[PDB]
C-alpha cells in the first residue's frame, strides 16, 4: 500500500522496498581498515531485499581527505570487509560499496611521505581557514595532476571495483559528488585545466566518463552506478552552469547504459527532468521523509529513495515507513566520532 514500500526491479536485483541506506562516512574504520562494528552496523540496517550503500571507501593510499575512513585497496581491508558483506547478505540485503578519492579535499598529514593532496588543479580550497599562527592552510593546497598520472587514477577506480567484486559486494557506487576528486574535474570553478581534462564541459566530464566507462566493462554495466550532485557546492564545488549538468549527465549516462543514477537534491528543472532523462534506475536523496519519498515514488518522481541521517539513527527505517511509526533523533555529535558503539549501533529498533 505504501509507495516507498513497493517493490522495484533494478538492473537484475529484486528490492523489497525503495528505502535505500545512503552511503554514510562514519570514520570508525581504524587505520582505514573496516571494523567489527560495521558488521553489526550494516547488518542492523539490512532487510530482506533492502538496498544498502556503504560509506565512502578509499581506492588508494592517497584517496583519503580525513581519518579512519575505510579503504578498499589492501588485501587486509578486503578481509575486514568480507565478513561485513556476509552479514548483509545473510540478511538478504543488496550491498553496494561507494568508491571515492577525495581529491583536493585533504591535507599533507593525510598523504604518505607528507606529499601534497592531488587534484585536477592547484586551486586552494577554503583559504580563509588557517592553522595556528601559521600560513599553512587547513587543506594543504593541491598539486595540479600531471596529465600522465590521470589515466592511472582512472585505473585506480576500475581496480577498487574489481576488489569489490572480490570482497563479495553486489557492485559499486562511483562517488561523483560532494567536492570529491571526481566532482573537482567536473566543476568549472575548480577545473581550469588547459589540456584534455579541462577547459570545457567536454574535457571536464572526460574524467567521470572514463570511470563510468572503465568500471562498467570491468564488473558489468548493470552493476555500476554513480552519485553526482550538480546543484551542491560543498567544499567550494559550485559549477557556473549546474542546472545543465543534471540533464546533460542524465543523458550522458544513457550512452554508457549503466545500472542507476543517484543524485542529491538541490537547495529545495532540478531532478524531475533528470529521472525522466535517465533510462535506468533513479535514486533520490536529500530532503526526504515519509510523504516526501512516498510522493516521489507514487507520483513516479523517483524509483528509489536514499535516506541519510534518518537511516543513520534508525536501523529499522523501511519497516517504519511501512508500519506507520515515528522516528528517533539522530545524534550529530557522534556521526563522526570513533566509538565502536556509541552513536553508531545503539540507535534502537521499534519493538
Ligand atoms: C555523517 C554523514 C556521512 C555521509 N557520508 C557520505 C558519503 O560517504 N558519501 C556520500 O555520497 N554521501 C554522504 N553523506 C550524505 C548522505 O548520503 C545524505 O546526507 C543524505 O542522503 C541526505 O539526506 P537528507 O538531506 O536528505 O535529509 C553523508 C551524510 C552524513 C550526515
Coordinates of C-alpha atoms and ligand atoms in Angstrom, one line a residue:
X1 CA 0.0 0.0 0.0
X2 CA 2.8 2.5 1.0
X3 CA 4.7 3.7 -2.2
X4 CA 8.1 3.7 -0.6
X5 CA 7.4 0.1 0.3
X6 CA 6.5 -1.0 -3.2
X7 CA 9.0 -3.4 -4.8
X8 CA 11.3 -2.3 -7.6
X9 CA 13.4 -4.1 -10.1
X10 CA 16.9 -2.6 -10.6
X11 CA 19.1 -3.9 -13.4
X12 CA 18.5 -7.5 -12.2
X13 CA 18.2 -7.2 -8.4
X14 CA 14.8 -7.6 -6.6
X15 CA 14.3 -4.9 -4.0
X16 CA 11.5 -5.4 -1.4
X17 CA 11.1 -1.7 -0.9
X18 CA 12.6 1.6 -2.1
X19 CA 14.1 2.9 1.1
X20 CA 17.8 3.0 0.4
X21 CA 20.5 3.3 3.1
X22 CA 22.6 6.3 1.8
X23 CA 26.4 6.0 1.8
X24 CA 27.5 7.4 5.1
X25 CA 31.2 8.1 6.1
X26 CA 31.4 7.3 9.8
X27 CA 35.1 7.5 10.4
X28 CA 35.3 4.3 12.6
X29 CA 37.4 2.2 10.3
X30 CA 40.5 2.4 12.4
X31 CA 43.6 2.9 10.3
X32 CA 41.4 2.7 7.2
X33 CA 40.6 -0.9 8.0
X34 CA 36.9 -1.8 8.3
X35 CA 35.9 -2.7 11.9
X36 CA 33.8 -5.4 13.6
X37 CA 31.2 -2.8 14.5
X38 CA 30.4 -2.2 10.8
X39 CA 29.4 -5.9 10.7
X40 CA 26.7 -5.1 13.3
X41 CA 26.1 -1.5 11.9
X42 CA 25.2 -2.5 8.3
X43 CA 23.6 -5.8 9.4
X44 CA 21.2 -3.8 11.6
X45 CA 20.2 -1.7 8.6
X46 CA 19.6 -4.7 6.3
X47 CA 16.2 -6.0 5.3
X48 CA 15.2 -9.0 3.2
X49 CA 15.9 -7.4 -0.2
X50 CA 16.9 -4.0 1.0
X51 CA 19.5 -1.9 -0.9
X52 CA 22.4 -0.6 1.1
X53 CA 25.2 1.8 0.1
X54 CA 28.4 1.8 2.1
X55 CA 30.2 4.9 3.5
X56 CA 32.8 6.2 1.0
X57 CA 35.8 3.8 0.9
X58 CA 39.2 4.8 -0.4
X59 CA 40.7 3.3 -3.5
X60 CA 44.3 4.0 -2.7
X61 CA 46.8 5.3 -0.2
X62 CA 46.2 8.9 -1.4
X63 CA 42.4 8.8 -1.8
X64 CA 41.7 10.0 1.8
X65 CA 40.9 13.5 2.9
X66 CA 40.1 12.7 6.6
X67 CA 40.9 10.0 9.1
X68 CA 39.8 6.3 9.6
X69 CA 37.5 6.1 6.5
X70 CA 37.9 2.6 5.1
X71 CA 40.0 1.9 2.0
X72 CA 39.3 -0.9 -0.4
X73 CA 42.9 -1.1 -1.7
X74 CA 44.8 -3.5 0.6
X75 CA 44.3 -7.3 0.8
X76 CA 43.8 -6.6 4.5
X77 CA 40.9 -4.1 4.1
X78 CA 39.2 -6.8 2.0
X79 CA 39.2 -9.4 4.8
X80 CA 38.0 -6.9 7.3
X81 CA 35.2 -6.1 4.8
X82 CA 34.4 -9.7 3.8
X83 CA 32.5 -10.7 6.9
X84 CA 30.6 -7.4 6.9
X85 CA 29.3 -8.3 3.5
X86 CA 28.3 -11.8 4.5
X87 CA 26.3 -10.4 7.4
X88 CA 24.5 -8.1 5.0
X89 CA 23.9 -11.0 2.5
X90 CA 22.8 -13.5 5.2
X91 CA 20.0 -11.0 6.0
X92 CA 19.1 -10.5 2.3
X93 CA 20.4 -7.1 1.5
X94 CA 21.8 -6.0 -1.9
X95 CA 25.0 -4.3 -0.7
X96 CA 27.0 -1.8 -2.8
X97 CA 30.2 -0.1 -1.7
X98 CA 30.6 3.5 -2.7
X99 CA 34.1 4.2 -4.1
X100 CA 35.9 7.6 -3.9
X101 CA 39.1 9.5 -3.8
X102 CA 38.7 12.9 -2.0
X103 CA 40.9 14.8 -4.5
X104 CA 41.8 18.3 -3.4
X105 CA 39.7 17.7 -0.1
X106 CA 42.6 16.5 2.0
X107 CA 45.9 17.6 3.7
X108 CA 49.6 16.7 3.8
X109 CA 49.1 14.8 7.1
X110 CA 46.7 12.5 5.2
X111 CA 49.0 11.9 2.3
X112 CA 52.0 9.5 2.6
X113 CA 55.5 11.0 2.9
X114 CA 53.5 14.1 3.6
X115 CA 53.0 14.7 -0.1
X116 CA 50.5 17.3 -1.2
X117 CA 46.9 16.3 -1.9
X118 CA 46.2 15.9 -5.6
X119 CA 43.5 17.5 -7.8
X120 CA 42.6 18.5 -11.4
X121 CA 44.1 21.9 -10.4
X122 CA 46.3 23.7 -8.0
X123 CA 43.3 25.8 -6.8
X124 CA 43.3 26.1 -3.0
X125 CA 40.1 25.1 -1.0
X126 CA 38.8 27.3 1.8
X127 CA 41.8 29.7 2.0
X128 CA 40.3 31.6 5.0
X129 CA 40.8 28.6 7.2
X130 CA 44.3 28.8 8.6
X131 CA 46.1 26.8 11.3
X132 CA 47.6 28.4 14.4
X133 CA 49.9 31.4 13.9
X134 CA 50.9 29.9 10.6
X135 CA 50.0 30.4 6.9
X136 CA 49.7 26.7 6.1
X137 CA 46.0 26.3 5.2
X138 CA 43.9 23.6 6.7
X139 CA 43.6 21.9 3.4
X140 CA 47.1 21.7 2.0
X141 CA 46.9 23.4 -1.4
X142 CA 46.6 20.8 -4.3
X143 CA 49.2 19.7 -6.8
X144 CA 47.8 20.0 -10.3
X145 CA 47.7 16.4 -11.5
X146 CA 50.4 15.6 -14.1
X147 CA 48.3 14.6 -17.1
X148 CA 50.4 11.5 -17.3
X149 CA 49.0 10.3 -13.9
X150 CA 45.4 10.7 -14.8
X151 CA 44.8 7.6 -16.8
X152 CA 46.3 5.7 -13.9
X153 CA 43.9 7.2 -11.4
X154 CA 41.1 6.2 -13.7
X155 CA 42.6 2.7 -13.3
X156 CA 42.6 3.1 -9.5
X157 CA 38.8 3.2 -9.7
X158 CA 38.5 0.2 -12.0
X159 CA 40.7 -1.7 -9.6
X160 CA 38.8 -0.9 -6.5
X161 CA 35.7 -2.1 -8.4
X162 CA 37.3 -5.4 -9.1
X163 CA 38.3 -5.7 -5.5
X164 CA 34.7 -5.0 -4.5
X165 CA 33.8 -8.0 -6.7
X166 CA 36.4 -9.8 -4.6
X167 CA 35.1 -8.9 -1.2
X168 CA 31.7 -10.1 -2.5
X169 CA 29.8 -6.8 -2.9
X170 CA 27.0 -6.8 -5.5
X171 CA 28.6 -3.8 -7.1
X172 CA 30.0 -0.3 -6.5
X173 CA 28.8 3.3 -6.5
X174 CA 31.2 5.7 -8.1
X175 CA 31.4 8.8 -5.9
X176 CA 30.9 11.6 -8.4
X177 CA 29.6 14.2 -5.9
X178 CA 30.4 16.4 -3.0
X179 CA 33.6 18.3 -3.8
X180 CA 35.5 14.9 -4.0
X181 CA 38.1 14.1 -6.7
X182 CA 35.6 13.3 -9.5
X183 CA 33.4 16.3 -8.9
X184 CA 36.5 18.5 -9.0
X185 CA 37.2 17.6 -12.6
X186 CA 33.6 18.3 -13.5
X187 CA 33.2 21.7 -11.8
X188 CA 34.4 24.8 -13.7
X189 CA 35.1 26.9 -10.6
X190 CA 37.5 24.2 -9.7
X191 CA 38.7 22.7 -13.0
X192 CA 40.7 25.3 -15.0
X193 CA 43.0 22.8 -16.8
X194 CA 44.1 23.8 -20.3
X195 CA 44.9 20.3 -21.5
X196 CA 42.5 17.5 -22.5
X197 CA 41.0 17.1 -18.9
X198 CA 39.8 20.6 -18.6
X199 CA 38.8 23.9 -20.3
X200 CA 35.3 22.9 -21.3
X201 CA 32.3 20.8 -20.2
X202 CA 33.6 18.2 -22.7
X203 CA 37.1 17.9 -21.3
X204 CA 35.7 18.3 -17.8
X205 CA 33.4 15.3 -17.9
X206 CA 36.1 13.2 -19.5
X207 CA 37.2 12.1 -16.1
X208 CA 33.9 10.7 -14.8
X209 CA 33.2 9.3 -18.2
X210 CA 36.4 7.3 -18.3
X211 CA 35.3 6.0 -14.9
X212 CA 31.7 5.0 -15.8
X213 CA 33.4 3.5 -18.9
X214 CA 36.1 1.5 -17.1
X215 CA 34.2 0.3 -14.1
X216 CA 31.3 -0.8 -16.3
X217 CA 33.4 -3.0 -18.6
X218 CA 35.2 -4.2 -15.5
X219 CA 32.4 -5.6 -13.4
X220 CA 29.4 -5.2 -15.8
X221 CA 27.4 -2.0 -16.5
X222 CA 24.2 -3.3 -14.8
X223 CA 26.2 -3.5 -11.5
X224 CA 27.7 0.0 -11.7
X225 CA 26.1 3.2 -10.6
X226 CA 27.4 6.7 -9.9
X227 CA 26.5 9.6 -7.5
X228 CA 26.5 13.2 -8.6
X229 CA 25.4 16.4 -7.0
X230 CA 25.1 19.0 -9.9
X231 CA 23.5 21.5 -7.6
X232 CA 25.7 21.3 -4.5
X233 CA 28.8 23.4 -3.8
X234 CA 30.1 21.5 -0.8
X235 CA 33.8 22.3 -0.4
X236 CA 33.6 25.2 -2.9
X237 CA 32.4 22.8 -5.7
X238 CA 30.0 25.1 -7.4
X239 CA 29.6 25.0 -11.2
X240 CA 28.9 28.0 -13.4
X241 CA 26.0 26.2 -15.0
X242 CA 24.8 23.5 -12.6
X243 CA 21.2 23.1 -13.8
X244 CA 22.6 22.0 -17.1
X245 CA 24.7 19.3 -15.6
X246 CA 21.7 17.4 -14.1
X247 CA 20.2 17.0 -17.6
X248 CA 23.4 16.6 -19.6
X249 CA 24.5 14.0 -17.1
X250 CA 21.2 12.2 -17.0
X251 CA 21.6 11.8 -20.8
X252 CA 25.4 11.3 -20.9
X253 CA 24.9 8.2 -18.8
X254 CA 22.3 6.5 -21.0
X255 CA 25.0 6.4 -23.6
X256 CA 27.1 4.2 -21.3
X257 CA 24.0 2.5 -20.2
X258 CA 24.5 1.7 -16.5
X259 CA 22.6 0.4 -13.5
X260 CA 21.5 3.7 -11.9
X261 CA 21.9 7.4 -11.4
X262 CA 21.9 8.6 -7.8
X263 CA 21.6 12.4 -7.4
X264 CA 21.4 14.7 -4.5
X265 CA 18.6 17.3 -4.4
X266 CA 19.3 21.0 -4.8
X267 CA 18.7 23.7 -2.2
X268 CA 15.0 22.9 -2.3
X269 CA 14.3 21.7 -13.7
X270 CA 16.2 20.1 -10.8
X271 CA 15.7 16.3 -10.5
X272 CA 12.4 15.8 -12.4
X273 CA 13.7 16.1 -15.9
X274 CA 16.6 14.0 -14.6
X275 CA 14.8 10.8 -13.8
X276 CA 12.8 11.5 -17.0
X277 CA 16.0 11.6 -19.0
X278 CA 17.8 8.6 -17.4
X279 CA 16.6 5.3 -18.9
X280 CA 17.8 3.2 -15.9
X281 CA 17.0 3.3 -12.2
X282 CA 16.9 6.7 -10.5
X283 CA 17.6 7.1 -6.8
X284 CA 16.6 10.3 -4.9
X285 CA 18.2 11.6 -1.7
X286 CA 18.4 14.9 0.1
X287 CA 15.3 16.2 1.9
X288 CA 13.2 13.0 2.1
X289 CA 10.9 11.8 4.9
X290 CA 7.6 9.9 4.7
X291 CA 5.4 11.7 2.1
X292 CA 8.5 13.4 0.6
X293 CA 9.6 10.0 -0.5
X294 CA 6.2 8.4 -0.9
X295 CA 5.1 11.3 -3.1
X296 CA 8.3 11.0 -5.2
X297 CA 7.7 7.3 -5.5
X298 CA 3.9 7.1 -6.2
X299 CA 4.0 10.2 -8.5
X300 CA 6.8 8.5 -10.4
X301 CA 9.3 11.2 -9.3
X302 CA 11.8 8.7 -8.2
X303 CA 12.4 4.9 -8.3
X304 CA 14.2 4.7 -5.0
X305 CA 14.7 7.0 -2.1
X306 CA 18.1 7.0 -0.2
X307 CA 17.9 8.4 3.4
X308 CA 20.9 9.6 5.2
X309 CA 20.6 11.0 8.7
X310 CA 17.2 9.4 9.3
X311 CA 18.5 5.9 8.4
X312 CA 21.7 6.5 10.4
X313 CA 19.6 6.9 13.6
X314 CA 17.1 4.1 12.9
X315 CA 18.3 0.7 12.0
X316 CA 14.7 -0.2 11.2
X317 CA 13.6 2.6 8.9
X318 CA 12.0 0.6 6.0
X319 CA 9.5 -1.1 8.4
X320 CA 8.6 2.1 10.0
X321 CA 7.8 3.7 6.6
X322 CA 5.6 0.7 6.3
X323 CA 4.3 0.3 9.8
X324 CA 3.2 4.0 10.5
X325 CA 5.6 4.8 13.2
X326 CA 7.6 8.0 14.2
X327 CA 11.4 8.1 14.2
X328 CA 14.2 8.5 16.8
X329 CA 16.5 11.6 16.7
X330 CA 20.0 11.4 15.0
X331 CA 22.9 12.3 17.2
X332 CA 25.0 14.8 15.2
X333 CA 27.9 15.0 17.7
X334 CA 28.5 11.2 17.2
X335 CA 28.1 10.7 13.5
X336 CA 31.8 11.3 13.1
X337 CA 33.2 10.2 16.4
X338 CA 35.1 7.0 16.8
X339 CA 33.4 4.8 19.4
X340 CA 32.6 1.3 18.1
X341 CA 29.1 1.5 19.6
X342 CA 28.0 4.9 20.9
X343 CA 26.2 6.9 18.2
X344 CA 26.9 4.0 15.8
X345 CA 25.0 0.9 16.7
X346 CA 23.0 2.0 19.9
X347 CA 20.1 3.6 17.9
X348 CA 17.2 1.3 18.9
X349 CA 14.7 -0.7 16.8
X350 CA 11.0 0.0 17.3
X351 CA 9.9 -3.2 19.2
Ligands
LIG1 C1 27.6 11.6 8.8 C2 27.3 11.6 7.3 C3 28.2 11.0 6.4 C4 27.9 11.0 5.0 N1 28.8 10.3 4.1 C5 28.6 10.3 2.8 C6 29.4 9.6 1.9 O1 30.4 8.9 2.3 N2 29.1 9.6 0.6 C7 28.0 10.3 0.1 O2 27.8 10.3 -1.1 N3 27.2 11.0 0.9 C8 27.4 11.0 2.2 N4 26.5 11.7 3.1 C9 25.4 12.4 2.7 C10 24.2 11.4 2.8 O3 24.4 10.4 1.7 C11 23.0 12.5 2.7 O4 23.1 13.2 4.0 C12 21.6 12.0 2.8 O5 21.1 11.2 1.7 C13 20.8 13.3 3.0 O6 19.6 13.1 3.5 P1 19.0 14.5 3.9 O7 19.3 15.7 3.1 O8 18.0 14.1 2.6 O9 17.6 14.5 4.6 C14 26.8 11.7 4.5 C15 25.9 12.4 5.4 C16 26.2 12.3 6.8 C17 25.3 13.1 7.7

